[PDB]
Every structure is written in C-alpha cells, then in structure tokens.
Design a protein around this ligand. Structure first.
Ligand SMILES: CCCCCCCCCCCCCCCCCC(=O)OC[C@H](COP(=O)([O-])OCC(O)COP(=O)([O-])OC[C@@H](COC(=O)CCCCCCCCCCCCCCCCC)OC(=O)CCCCCCCCCCCCCCCCC)OC(=O)CCCCCCCCCCCCCCCCC
Ligand code: BCL
Ligand code: BCL
Ligand SMILES: CC[C@H]1c2cc3[nH]c4c(c3C)C(=O)[C@H](C(=O)OC)c4c3nc(cc4[nH]c(cc(n2)[C@@H]1C)c(C(C)=O)c4C)[C@@H](C)[C@@H]3CCC(=O)OC/C=C(\C)CCC[C@H](C)CCC[C@H](C)CCCC(C)C
Ligand SMILES: CC[C@H]1c2cc3[nH]c4c(c3C)C(=O)[C@H](C(=O)OC)c4c3nc(cc4[nH]c(cc(n2)[C@@H]1C)c(C(C)=O)c4C)[C@@H](C)[C@@H]3CCC(=O)OC/C=C(\C)CCC[C@H](C)CCC[C@H](C)CCCC(C)C
Ligand SMILES: COC1=C(OC)C(=O)C(C/C=C(\C)CC/C=C(\C)CC/C=C(\C)CC/C=C(\C)CC/C=C(/C)CC/C=C(\C)CC/C=C(/C)CC/C=C(/C)CC/C=C(\C)CCC=C(C)C)=C(C)C1=O
Ligand SMILES: COC1=C(OC)C(=O)C(C/C=C(\C)CC/C=C(\C)CC/C=C(\C)CC/C=C(\C)CC/C=C(\C)CC/C=C(\C)CC/C=C(/C)CC/C=C(/C)CC/C=C(\C)CCC=C(C)C)=C(C)C1=O
Ligand SMILES: COC(C)(C)C/C=C/C(C)=C/C=C/C(C)=C/C=C/C(C)=C/C=C\C=C(C)\C=C\C=C(/C)CC/C=C(\C)CCC=C(C)C
Ligand SMILES: CCCCCCCCCCCC[N+](C)(C)[O-]
Ligand SMILES: CCCCCCCCCCCC[N+](C)(C)[O-]
Ligand SMILES: CCCCCCCCCCCC[N+](C)(C)[O-]
Ligand SMILES: CCCCCCCCCCCC[N+](C)(C)[O-]
Ligand SMILES: CCCCCCCCCCCC[N+](C)(C)[O-]
Ligand SMILES: CCCCCCCCCCCC[N+](C)(C)[O-]
Ligand SMILES: CCCC[C@H](O)[C@H](O)CO
Ligand SMILES: [Cl-]
Ligand SMILES: [Fe+3]
Ligand SMILES: [K+]
Ligand SMILES: [K+]
Lengths: 239, 302, 281
C-alpha cells in the first residue's frame, strides 16, 4: 500500500490541478489571443478562459467583470512592416505624439484614483494639508534639465500620494508659464538641478497636459508616464 | 546616471495616518509611534498605531512567557553569570523530556518540565496570534488570505513540536529551544531518517523555497521596473489595467512565452510560498511515523 | 497570436546588436540577437548532454549525469568523456544564461521599462558561476564543481557540506538561510495581503492600499507600504543568493576546517574564556 506513496501521488495530482487553476486565473486579462489585425486567433492554447468574476469598485465607480470583451478603446498608429506575422509594426506618425511603442498609454478611466475615504489619492503638495518635505533635497525651486543638457523648466511643486505619503510627480513650469507633471521615478534630484534623461528639453512641451490643475486622472497619468518613458527610445533625433 | 527606485530621493510627511475604521474597535488602537526617517528611505516612515485587544494582550503575554521561560533556563545554565551568559549564549538549550517519560507531564522541571511549560506558552501565543490575523482582517472587511497562509506555517510548527511527537509517543522527539541545539536536532533528524534528500516532500519543499526567491525576485524587479508607470498601485491596476500591467505582462510573455496578470501573480505568489511549509510538514510528519528511512523507501517507490 | 493589448508595443527598436536583423518574434517569444545566441548555446549544450548520455550508456533523465574532470586534472582540460564535456557544457550554460539576461535587456529597452529584472537574474547567474567557476578556480580544480545530474548534484551537496562537519555552522550560510526563510514569509504575506484587499468579504467593495497599511499596522504596528514590499522582496531574494554565493566562496578557500570550530573565536575571548560555568566551563 504505503501512505507516503499515496501522499506523493496525490500531491502531484493536486499540483497539476493547481497549476491549471493558476494559469486560467491569469487569463482574466488580454485573452482571447488575437491576430495582428485584431481578430481572434485560431489557436488559443489548451487552457480555457475562466468563468467570470466581478469586482465591486468603491465609491460608486461600478464593477469590473473579467474575462470580458477586450477592446483597446483608442486608435493605434502602427502599420505592418512585413507580409507575414511576427515582425515589428512601424509608427505611421510621431510615436511620442501618437502614444505607441514605449510611448504607449492605456485607455484607463478618466477619473482620479481615490483613497479609502473617497478623496483624490494624488494631490499637489500645496493642496495637501500638513504635507511637506521631510528628508532629502527638496526639489521645489530647482531648474529642470533634459538629456540635451538644456534647461526645460523649474520645479514648482511635488504631487504627493496622500494615503501612502510619497512623492509621485514633480510639477514643472515651462517657458510659457504652463506646467507638466514628471514621474518621480524618471527624474534625478541633484544638488543644483533635477535631471531628466528621458526627454530633451524641446520635448517637455509635448508632455500630455492635465485637464484640471489640482487633480490627475488615471488616463492622464498613463499618457504622461508613457510619453516620458518613450523618450528613452525616441528622443534620439535630434536634429 | 539612472535612478532605480530602490531608495527614495525625497521623503514627504503629513499628519499621522490613523488608518481605515470600518468595523475596528478604535478604542483598542494605540496612538502613533515615532516616524523614522531611516526607514523612510526604503519604506514607510510611520510607526504605529497598533491594535491590541484582549486577544493581542494574551498573545504577547504568552509569547513573552515562552521567551522568558527559555531565558531563565539559559541563566540557570550560565550559573547566573552574565559573562558566561553572553559567552555560551548559542550553546544553551531547553530540551524536552527524555523518551522514558513518553507523553506524560511527569518529568521534573529541570528534566523536561520547563520545556513543556515553555511549549505550552508558545502554543497559546501562536494560536491566539493566528486568531488575530483572522479577526484583524475581518474587522476591516478583508478576505482571510493571511490567516490561511499563516496556517501553512503553523502546520510545519505543529508537526515538529506537537503532532509528530504525539504520533511517535514521546515529547523527546520535539525540537529543543536553543540556537545551536535546534540545528543539531535538524541534522540528526535527517541522519536518523536516512537522509532527507530522499524524501520527495523535502525536495518539493526546497523547489518551493528556492521558487519563492525566484518569484519574489521576478515580481519585485518587475514592479520596480514598471514603477515609472505606477506599477505598485496594484489594486487599481487590477481594477483598471494600465500600461504598467501591460508592459509587465509583455516582458514575461516575450521572455518565456506566457505571463500573469496583476491579480494572478499574487495567487502564484501565495501558493509558491505556502507550499514550502505544506509539503514540508507532510514530509516531516511521515518521517518515523510511516517511513523510517527515506533512502530505503525510495528504493521501493518514488 | 498576440494579447489583446499587445500590438501597440511591438514596434521596432531596442536591440543591442544587429539593428533590425533579429528584431522579430516567434509566437509570443521575442528573438533578438541574444535569442539567437541563447538558442545556439542551449542547443549545443543539450546536444552535448545527449552525447554524454550516449557515452555513459543511459537515456533515463534521472540517471544521466555529466561530471567535471577529476581533481587530478587540476584546472587543465580533460578528455571529453572524462570531464571535457562538462567543461564545454558549462561554457554553453554560461553563454545561454548571459545571453538570456541580455535578451531580457533588449526586451526592457523595447518596452521602455527599468532593467531590474535581468539585474536580479544576474545574481542567480553569479551564484551558479561561484559553484562551477570562481570556487573551483580558487581551489585549484574543476573537480570541486558540481555534476549535472538531477540526483548526483544532491550527492555533491551532501558530500561537500559534510566535508566541513555540519554545514549549518557556516555563519554566511546562516545569514543566507535567514534571508530565504524571511523571503518566503514576505512572499506569503504580500500575496495574501493584496488578494485579501482585492477579494474582500462576500458582497463588499474592493479594499484599498489604505486598508492594506491599516491591516498591517493593526497586526504588527508597522506597514512597509506598497512600494516598500516590492523593494523588500527583491532585497530579501537577492541577499539570500548573495550570502549563498558568499558562504560557498569562503568554504575551501579561506576557511576549510570544521565550521563548528569557527565559533571558538568568540568563546575564547580573554575576558571570559576561563570563567567557570556554562556549557563551555
Ligand atoms: C496530499 C495532497 C493534498 C495537498 C494539500 C493541498 C491543500 C489544498 C487546500 C485548498 C485551499 C483552498 C480552499 C478554497 O476554499 O478555495 C477558495 C479560493 C478563493 O480565493 P479568493 O477567490 O481570493 O477568495 C476571496 C473571498 O474573500 C473569499 O475568501 P476568504 O477571505 O473567506 O478566504 C480566502 C481563501 C484563501 O485562498 C487562497 O487564495 C490561498 C490560501 C492558501 C491555503 C493554505 C492551506 C493551509 C492548510 C494547512 C494544513 C495542511 C494539511 C495538509 C494535509 O480561502 C480559502 O482558500 C479557504 C482555506 C481554508 C483553510 C482551512 C484548512 C483547515 C485545516 O480559491 C482557490 O484558492 C482554489 C484553490 C485551488 C486548488 C485547486 C486544486 C485542484 C485539485 C485537484 C484537481 C485536479 C485533477 C487533475 C487530474
Ligand atoms: C543536515 C540537514 C538536512 C536537512 C534537514 C531538515 C529538516 C529536519 C527539516 C528541513 C526542512 C526544510 N529544509 Mg532541509 N535539510 C537538509 C538540506 C537542505 C537544503 C540544502 C541546500 O542542502 C535546503 C535548501 C533545505 C531546505 C529546507 C526547507 C525547504 C525546509 C524548511 C522550510 C521552512 O520555511 O522552514 C521554516 C519555517 C518554519 C519552521 C515555520 C515556523 C512557523 C511558526 C508558527 C513560527 C513561530 C514564531 C515564534 C513564535 C517566534 C516569534 C519571534 C518573532 C520575532 C516574534 N534543506 C539536510 C539534508 N530540513 C524542514 C522541512 O519541512 O523538511 C521537510 C524540516 O523540518
Ligand atoms: C548536508 C548538506 C548541508 C548543506 C550544504 C550546502 C552546500 C554544499 C551548499 C548549500 C547551499 C545552500 N544551502 Mg545549505 N546545507 C545544509 C542545510 C541547509 C538548510 C537546512 C534547512 O538544513 C537550508 C535551508 C539550506 C540552505 C542553503 C541555501 C542558503 C543555499 C542554496 C541556494 C543557493 O545557493 O541558490 C543559488 C542559486 C543557484 C545556484 C541557481 C542558479 C540558476 C541558474 C542561473 C539558471 C538555471 C536555468 C536552468 C538550467 C533552466 C532549465 C530550463 C527551464 C526551466 C525551461 N541548507 C546541510 C547542513 N548548502 C549552496 C550555496 O550556497 O550555493 C551557492 C551550496 O552549494
Ligand atoms: C508560509 C511559509 C512561511 C511563513 C508564513 C507566515 N508567517 C507568519 C504569517 C505568515 C503568512 C503571518 O501572518 C504571521 C505574521 O503575523 O506575520 C507578520 C507569521 C509569523 N511568522 C513568524 C515567525 C516565523 N515565520 C517563519 C517562517 C514562515 N512563515 C515560512 C517561511 C519563521 C522561520 C523559522 O522560518 C519564523 C521565526 C512571526 C513573525 C509571525 C507569527 C507571530 C506569532 O505567532 O507570535 C506569537 C509571539 C508573540 C506574540 C510574542 C513573542 C515574543 C518574542 C519571542 C520575544 C520578544 C521580546 C524582546 C524584548 C525582543 C527580542 C527580539 C529577538 C527575538 C530578536
Ligand atoms: C537571484 C534570486 C533567484 C533567481 C532569480 C531569477 N531567476 C531567473 C530570473 C530571475 C530574476 C529571470 O529573469 C529568469 C527567467 O526567465 O525566469 C522565468 C530566471 C531563471 N531562473 C531559472 C531557474 C532557476 N533559478 C533558480 C534560482 C534563482 N533565480 C534565485 C534564488 C534556480 C534554483 C536551483 O534555485 C533555478 C533552477 C530559469 C527558469 C530562468 C532562466 C532561464 C534561462 O537561462 O534560459 C536559457 C537557458 C536554457 C533554456 C537552457 C540552458 C541549457 C544548458 C546549456 C545545459 C544545462 C546545464 C545545466 C547547468 C544543467 C543543470 C542540471 C541540474 C540537475 C543541476
Ligand atoms: C500590499 O503591500 C504590502 C504592504 O504595504 C501595504 C505592507 O506593508 C506589507 C507588510 C510588510 C511588512 C510590515 C514588513 C515585514 C517585514 C519582514 C517580512 C522582515 C524584514 C526583515 C529584515 C529586513 C531583516 C531580516 C534579517 C536577516 C534575514 C539577516 C539575519 C540573520 C540571522 C542569522 C538571524 C539570527 C538571529 C539570531 C542568532 C538570534 C539572536 C539570539 C538569541 C539568543 C535570541 C533569539 C530569539 C528568539 C525568540 C528565537 C527566535 C528568533 C527569531 C525568529 C529571530 C528573528 C530573526 C531575524 C533574522 C531578525 C505587505 C506584506 C504588503 O504586501
Ligand atoms: C505583475 O507583473 C508580472 C507579470 O505580468 C502581470 C508576470 O507575467 C510575471 C511573471 C510570472 C509568472 C507568469 C508566474 C509563473 C512563473 C514562475 C512560477 C517562475 C518560473 C517559471 C518557469 C519555470 C517557466 C520557465 C520558462 C522558460 C524559461 C521559458 C521556456 C523557454 C523556452 C522553450 C526557450 C525558448 C526561447 C529561446 C530559445 C530564446 C529566443 C527565442 C527563440 C524562439 C529563438 C529562435 C531562434 C532561432 C534561430 C530558431 C531556429 C530554429 C531551428 C533551426 C529549428 C528548431 C528546432 C528545434 C529542435 C525546436 C511577474 C513576476 C510579474 O510580476
Ligand atoms: C537577558 O535575558 C532575558 C532572560 C531577560 C531574556 C533572554 C531570553 C533568551 C536568551 C531567550 C532565548 C530563546 C531562544 C534561543 C529560542 C529559540 C527557539 C527555537 C530555535 C525554536 C525552534 C523550534 C520550535 C518548535 C518547532 C516548537 C514547537 C512547539 C509547539 C508546536 C508547542 C507544542 C505544545 C506542547 C508540547 C505543550 C502541550 C500542552 C498543551 C496543554 C497543549
Ligand atoms: C513550475 C511552474 C511552471 C508553470 C508553467 C505553466 C504555464 C503554461 C502557460 C502557457 C499558455 C500561454 N498561452 C498560450 C495561453 O498564451
Ligand atoms: C514587524 C515590525 C514590528 C515593528 C513594531 C513597531 C511597534 C510600534 C507601535 C507604536 C506604539 C507607540 N506607543 C503606544 C508606545 O506610544
Ligand atoms: C488559544 C487562542 C484561540 C484561537 C482564537 C480563535 C479566533 C478564531 C476566529 C474565527 C471566528 C469565525 N467567525 C465566523 C465566528 O467569525
Ligand atoms: C505555484 C508554482 C508551482 C511550481 C512547481 C515546481 C516543481 C519542481 C520539481 C521538483 C521535484 C522534487 N521531487 C524529489 C519530489 O521529485
Ligand atoms: C518546469 C517547466 C516549465 C516549462 C514552461 C514553458 C513555458 C511555455 C510557453 C508556452 C507558450 C508557447 N505558445 C504561445 C506557442 O503556446
Ligand atoms: C561587496 C558588496 C556587495 C553588497 C551586498 C549586496 C546584497 C544584496 C543586494 C540587493 C540590492 C538590490 N535591492 C534588493 C536592495 O534592491
Ligand atoms: C530495474 C530498473 C533499472 C533501470 C535501468 O537499468 C536504467 O533506465 C538504465 O538507463
Ligand atoms: Cl488562489
Ligand atoms: Fe505585488
Ligand atoms: K501642504
Ligand atoms: K531509521
């Protein structure tokens, strides 16, 4: 007989089922798989989509049910470079402006993330009661330099995550008096400047702008973060 | 150079965050502790508040009694000499009853009794703390995943000190409380059962342990890599997938041909972790009870 | 086939070598110059394992074992059937792993993401190389490396460890294990915490990270925070592997006696060395 043999055989049956379950749970976004033209792929693999689950979202924001119909919900300015599958797709315009490649953004909801109390999670520090810089070089006041070593603007605030008490963006004022948000993760605060490797100074103007000066929506965050990260590949030319 | 978001460049602080209320009895929350700027370079600066109700007090009291029972035994072994206490600290050990005592509670204090008292206090501390992990989640309306995950760790602990010794018929089989002595116990356990490398549940426990380091290295790296797109705001990425979650998925899709989602990586995570101690407790529990010698067993099975 | 949201990312660019020549995919897999290198190294390696299998006289994957040259060969080359295949296979492995890492770098570049992943992977690669390259070279023979076999490599672990008594007494090994156990604890907690907020009690709204901080503060008096926990996992994992490589690189080189005896430096400090009492007096 043997209880240890029963246990090891049983465990391997269990683990196979567990892996099957875990894989299907991980197909709740992005599937069914598509051809390059957006139509459903003929081979979906041996794992089926899981039965749907529904997340109840806080503050009257509704629900998310996944899996569900996938749609990009935005135009994608790319075209095939080959006559068969598997090759890159070339930007049909300016990929920074069009938001493709590493400049890509997702059509998230055009509302701000809220905290557990239903208040905007990210606020400019100037509007965040009691918030202040508590350690490190305070970036407010510093000129902002791009990868061309030219000054694009000056830091006029920090946008802070209120519940998690963290710096999320720098607000940078440009020569025309408008501002843009830069992700904190993409700037280097130095003693005499903030340096931004991803963008040359002349690309700061094109950072997507926010529709209201004291809040930022998840859609806007995705457009800002995407554009800034896309500069690593695309700031290149010059001239 | 390029910033990597391993330590923060600038810290911000606001009023102390007293937390969400939900159904929590606020009367049992402490005030906040001090803020630590040192910690704040890597994680949150804020210390406290802590919740401590009757169960938490019982758990801390009992845990302290466990630690102090072992500790006074150490002092005793030190001949009450502070110099000797520091010198031989890792050599002291509170040991269980000899095998001749079986599972009785009749061993003298100095020959197992104190081990039983200490173990009793540990039993109460850990299970009351388990109760806390459940009730703290319940009071906030959260699922009970933590209490379930903690139960996998509790399974190995219980097998080691309680279930296996009871099934073997003596407390002498349990783990002593000492730094070196518990490592000596572990080595001996393996030698006596024919080399645990031949126990398939041990090899699995190792696959999950190593796999937990593989996976948290993958996952931590991944989230940091997409932190420039808000990647660590995982709950909202679950609710409203963003370019962080898509770039993360596609890194792995392009690398190894498949990927996770922002929620599902956490299910891979919780299982990779818990399976360490679930498979481990099974492997230990069968040892000596069902299988005297894993080498021998492996010659007739697999 | 592509994920529904994938096409917009499949642009040209990011390669380190070859320009557009290997800038394409096979199914889900990105290729790149380093995809070709990984394929060459892996394939050659696997072919050489199969030839080793033929020279050993077995196809059973639980029996195939490729051993390094015996200690008498020192750091020279050995005949292919007597350690040379191991040597070439190790070159292939190292080539395959480093190529995999560099391919990961080409993928990060195309996606516009940080390089944290391949940097992390490099710790694993360096632990591998500590075992098969740096340690053997410092010890003066390829034969101190581990053999490539599912079970024979465990034989090497047990034989190497017991060469120094109970290996548990290696202080770097104690640190390494503490990081491995701490990492698994942190992984369980992190997975649990996020799922418990995303999947709250029946009928309830998803919780927020605020609830996640609250839960931990309530339980232990501290929350490391959603950025911190990912920093922490990465540090705990990589520290575990750093201290593993460390624990082995010092073993057989700077310390080669029984590890238990290392601890005598402390017990024998003159201010308490001769005091009566205790385990040691
Ligand atoms: C030997 C071989 C056996 C190996 C042992 C394996 C152990 C299996 C344990 C199963 C636990 C899952 C139970 C459950 O209710 O799942 C719901 C769970 C719901 O999670 P959720 O949707 O996030 O819940 C949200 C709500 O808040 C609602 O959730 P909640 O907040 O109320 O709870 C969260 C969720 C937590 O679920 C998780 O996400 C993971 C938690 C890890 C579980 C740790 C178990 C610890 C037990 C230690 C004792 C070990 C004894 C070993 C013997 O709850 C549970 O899973 C219930 C666990 C109860 C444990 C009580 C045990 C007492 C003893 O969904 C699953 O996780 C499914 C598990 C997948 C396993 C599939 C196995 C396949 C079987 C083989 C078939 C294939 C054949 C192929 C040929
Ligand atoms: C010479 C030694 C033997 C051997 C003997 C053993 C024995 C004996 C055991 C293991 C076990 C394990 N071994 Mg082995 N092992 C050997 C060789 C190895 C090698 C190797 C590279 O050679 C590796 C990688 C491992 C790896 C492993 C792990 C996978 C596993 C433990 C998992 C775990 O998380 O435990 C750690 C987790 C716990 C102990 C859970 C603790 C939970 C409790 C509830 C915590 C209470 C806290 C307390 C109240 C204090 C609070 C203090 C706080 C500050 C408040 N072994 C050799 C062959 N190994 C264990 C196992 O499961 O084997 C199947 C085990 O019992
Ligand atoms: C009797 C045996 C001795 C002992 C002797 C040894 C010896 C000897 C060693 C260890 C090592 C370790 N031991 Mg010890 N150890 C013992 C008891 C234990 C116990 C315990 C509970 O008792 C534990 C928890 C541990 C724990 C550990 C870890 C600290 C460390 C192993 C991990 C590591 O190096 O990862 C590092 C990770 C790697 C090496 C993996 C590299 C992966 C590569 C880069 C990629 C592979 C890709 C693959 C080919 C792809 C295939 C195809 C795809 C899957 C499709 N030991 C007993 C006392 N221990 C080892 C160590 O520190 O090594 C540096 C080591 O050599
Ligand atoms: C699933 C596998 C892994 C796992 C999971 C896990 N552990 C858990 C949990 C989970 C999911 C919890 O929810 C629970 C927790 O609350 O974590 C924060 C826990 C926990 N795992 C713990 C420990 C632990 N886990 C371990 C391992 C693991 N835990 C696995 C690898 C290990 C080892 C050996 O590897 C240890 C030591 C505790 C931190 C915590 C459970 C706490 C508990 O039960 O506490 C009761 C004890 C007290 C209330 C008080 C004790 C008092 C002290 C002993 C003395 C302190 C006094 C002195 C003034 C300070 C001295 C400090 C020194 C000791 C350094
Ligand atoms: C540094 C922390 C931890 C870590 C991290 C880590 N590992 C990683 C990564 C990271 C961040 C990846 O990005 C990468 C990955 O793609 O994971 C999905 C990877 C990876 N970790 C892997 C495995 C692995 N990692 C381990 C460990 C760890 N990885 C650490 C604990 C272990 C062990 C034993 O603990 C293993 C087995 C692979 C899944 C993947 C690397 C894939 C790769 O390199 O692919 C290219 C190579 C091939 C397809 C095959 C090469 C074949 C050889 C030419 C011949 C075989 C030689 C081999 C030496 C024989 C060994 C026999 C054994 C029986 C001893
Ligand atoms: C969604 O987002 C999330 C958040 O955001 C919202 C979160 O907030 C959190 C919550 C997360 C946290 C609150 C952080 C949790 C913290 C950890 C998991 C651990 C962090 C730990 C470290 C950074 C350091 C650990 C140190 C290591 C590994 C090196 C230590 C090496 C050793 C060899 C230890 C040796 C110890 C000895 C010899 C003991 C000394 C001698 C004695 C005689 C006393 C012994 C006493 C005892 C009681 C014996 C038991 C001892 C233990 C257990 C020792 C403790 C061990 C240590 C290693 C310290 C999560 C999960 C999350 O998901
Ligand atoms: C939050 O976010 C996150 C995600 O998302 C949201 C994630 O997803 C993940 C990722 C995590 C998971 C999905 C969880 C599950 C993961 C684990 C438990 C970790 C362990 C993983 C595994 C064991 C899987 C390992 C798999 C691997 C390494 C891949 C398998 C690999 C191959 C088959 C190798 C193939 C690839 C190669 C060779 C490189 C390049 C590719 C090519 C196709 C090369 C082609 C080139 C040629 C020249 C071909 C020529 C062909 C010829 C001549 C003929 C062919 C001949 C043959 C014999 C074939 C994380 C962490 C995350 O945090
Ligand atoms: C300065 O000095 C003072 C005294 C002030 C403080 C110093 C204290 C010291 C030095 C403390 C040292 C503590 C140490 C070194 C502790 C080490 C502990 C270790 C390594 C423990 C390891 C494993 C323990 C296990 C697996 C225990 C499992 C126990 C159980 C499952 C409990 C089972 C319960 C039993 C047997 C009781 C049964 C009775 C009932 C009623 C159920
Ligand atoms: C050790 C655990 C390894 C688990 C790997 C299982 C994953 C297979 C998933 C491939 C399916 C992807 N696909 C085709 C649906 O897109
Ligand atoms: C897992 C890490 C444990 C950290 C423990 C921190 C506890 C601090 C609790 C604050 C208490 C402040 N008080 C009440 C003393 O004033
Ligand atoms: C020795 C300590 C005793 C353990 C503490 C028990 C608390 C368990 C909580 C489960 C409560 C379940 N329920 C549905 C009644 O809420
Ligand atoms: C949730 C992730 C699941 C990962 C599965 C990893 C399987 C590792 C294979 C180890 C085989 C050990 N042994 C001796 C039992 O055969
Ligand atoms: C421990 C073994 C792990 C092997 C898992 C390998 C990953 C499978 C990738 C499957 C994707 C291939 N595809 C898209 C053509 O289906
Ligand atoms: C010789 C000096 C080496 C320093 C030791 C390195 C320890 C592990 C490094 C992990 C660093 C990355 N992390 C996780 C903090 O982000
Ligand atoms: C009795 C079982 C023997 C196994 C057999 O000799 C091996 O597969 C040889 O490859
Ligand atoms: Cl699950
Ligand atoms: Fe996470
Ligand atoms: K303010
Ligand atoms: K035996």
């Amino acid at each position: 007989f043997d209880l240890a043999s029963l246990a090891i055989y049983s465990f391997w049956i269990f683990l196979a089922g567990l892996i099957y379950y875990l894989q299907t749970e991980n197909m709740r976004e992005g599937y069914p798989l598509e051809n390059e033209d957006g139509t459903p792929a003929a081979n979906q693999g041996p794992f089926p989509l899981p039965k749907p689950k529904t997340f109840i979202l806080p503050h009257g924001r509704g629900t998310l049910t996944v899996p569900g119909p996938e749609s990009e919900d935005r135009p994608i300015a790319l075209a095939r470079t080959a006559v068969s599958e598997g090759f890159p797709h070339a930007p049909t315009g300016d990929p920074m402006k069009d938001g493709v490649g590493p400049a890509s953004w997702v059509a998230r909801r055009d509302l701000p993330e809220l905290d557990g109390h239903g208040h905007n999670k990210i606020k400019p520090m100037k509007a965040a009661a009691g918030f202040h810089v508590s350690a490190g070089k305070n970036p407010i006041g510093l000129p902002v330099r791009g990868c061309d070593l030219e000054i694009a603007g000056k830091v006029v605030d920090i946008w802070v995550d209120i519940p998690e008490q963290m710096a999320r963006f720098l607000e940078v004022e440009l020569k025309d008096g408008s501002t843009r948000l830069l992700p904190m993760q993409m700037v280097k605060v130095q003693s005499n400047r903030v340096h931004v490797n991803a963008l040359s100074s002349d690309l700061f103007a094109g950072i997507p702008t926010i529709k209201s000066p004291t809040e930022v929506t998840l859609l806007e965050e995705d457009k800002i973060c995407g554009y800034v990260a896309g500069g690593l590949m695309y700031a290149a030319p010059k001239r | 150079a390029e910033y990597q978001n391993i330590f923060s460049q600038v810290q911000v602080r606001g009023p102390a965050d007293l937390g969400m209320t939900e159904d929590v009895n606020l009367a049992n929350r402490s005030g906040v502790g001090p803020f630590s700027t040192l910690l704040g370079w890597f994680g949150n600066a804020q210390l406290g508040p802590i919740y401590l109700g009757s169960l938490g007090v019982l758990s801390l009291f009992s845990g302290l009694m466990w630690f102090f029972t072992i500790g006074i035994w150490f002092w005793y072994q030190a001949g009450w000499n502070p110099a000797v206490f520091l010198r031989d600290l890792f050599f002291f050990s509170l040991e269980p009853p000899a095998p001749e005592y079986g599972l009785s509670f009749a061993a003298p204090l100095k020959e197992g009794g104190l081990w039983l008292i200490a173990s009793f206090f540990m039993f109460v501390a850990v299970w009351s703390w388990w109760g806390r992990t459940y009730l703290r989640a319940q009071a906030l309306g959260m699922g009970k995943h933590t209490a379930w995950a903690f139960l996998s760790a509790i399974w190995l602990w219980m097998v080691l000190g309680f279930i296996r010794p009871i099934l073997m018929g003596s407390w002498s089989e349990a783990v002593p409380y000492g730094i070196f002595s518990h490592l000596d116990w572990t080595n001996n356990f393996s030698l006596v059962h024919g080399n645990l490398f031949y126990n398939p549940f041990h090899g699995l426990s190792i696959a999950f342990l190593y796999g937990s380091a593989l996976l948290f290295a993958m996952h931590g790296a991944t989230i940091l890599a997409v932190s420039r797109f808000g990647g660590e705001r995982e709950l909202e990425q679950i609710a409203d997938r963003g370019t962080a979650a898509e770039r993360a998925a596609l890194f792995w899709r392009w690398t190894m041909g498949f990927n996770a989602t922002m929620e599902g990586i956490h299910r891979w995570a919780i299982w990779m972790a818990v399976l360490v101690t679930l498979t481990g407790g099974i492997g230990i529990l069968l040892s000596g009870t069902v299988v005297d010698n894993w080498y021998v067993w492996g010659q007739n099975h697999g | 086939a592509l994920l529904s949201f994938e096409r917009k990312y499949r642009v040209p660019g990011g390669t380190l070598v070859g320009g557009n020549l290997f800038d394409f995919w096979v199914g889900p897999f990105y290729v790149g110059f380093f995809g070709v290198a990984t394929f060459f190294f892996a394939a050659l390696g696997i072919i050489l394992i199969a030839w080793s299998a033929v020279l050993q006289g077995t196809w059973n994957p639980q029996l195939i074992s490729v051993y390094p040259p015996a200690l008498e060969y020192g750091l020279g080359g050995a005949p292919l059937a007597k350690g040379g295949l191991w040597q070439i296979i190790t070159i292939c492995a190292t080539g395959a792993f480093v190529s995999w890492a560099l391919r990961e770098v080409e993928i990060c570049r195309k996606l516009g993401i940080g390089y944290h992943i391949p940097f992390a992977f490099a710790f694993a690669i360096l632990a591998y190389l500590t075992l098969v390259l740096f340690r053997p070279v410092m010890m003066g023979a390829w034969g101190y490396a581990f053999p490539y076999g599912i079970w024979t490599h465990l034989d090497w672990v047990s034989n190497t460890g017991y060469t120094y008594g109970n290996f548990h007494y290696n202080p770097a090994h104690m640190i390494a294990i503490s990081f491995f156990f701490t990492n698994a604890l942190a992984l369980a907690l992190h997975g649990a915490l996020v799922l418990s907020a995303a999947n709250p009690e029946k009928g309830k709204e998803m919780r927020t990270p605020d609830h996640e901080d609250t839960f931990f503060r309530d339980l232990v008096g501290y929350s490391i925070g959603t950025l911190g926990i990912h920093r922490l996992g990465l540090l705990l994992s990589l520290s575990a592997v750093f201290f593993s490589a460390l624990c082995m690189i010092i073993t057989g080189t700077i310390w080669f006696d029984q590890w238990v005896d290392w601890w005598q430096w402390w017990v024998k400090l003159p201010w308490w060395a001769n005091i009566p009492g205790g385990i040691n007096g």
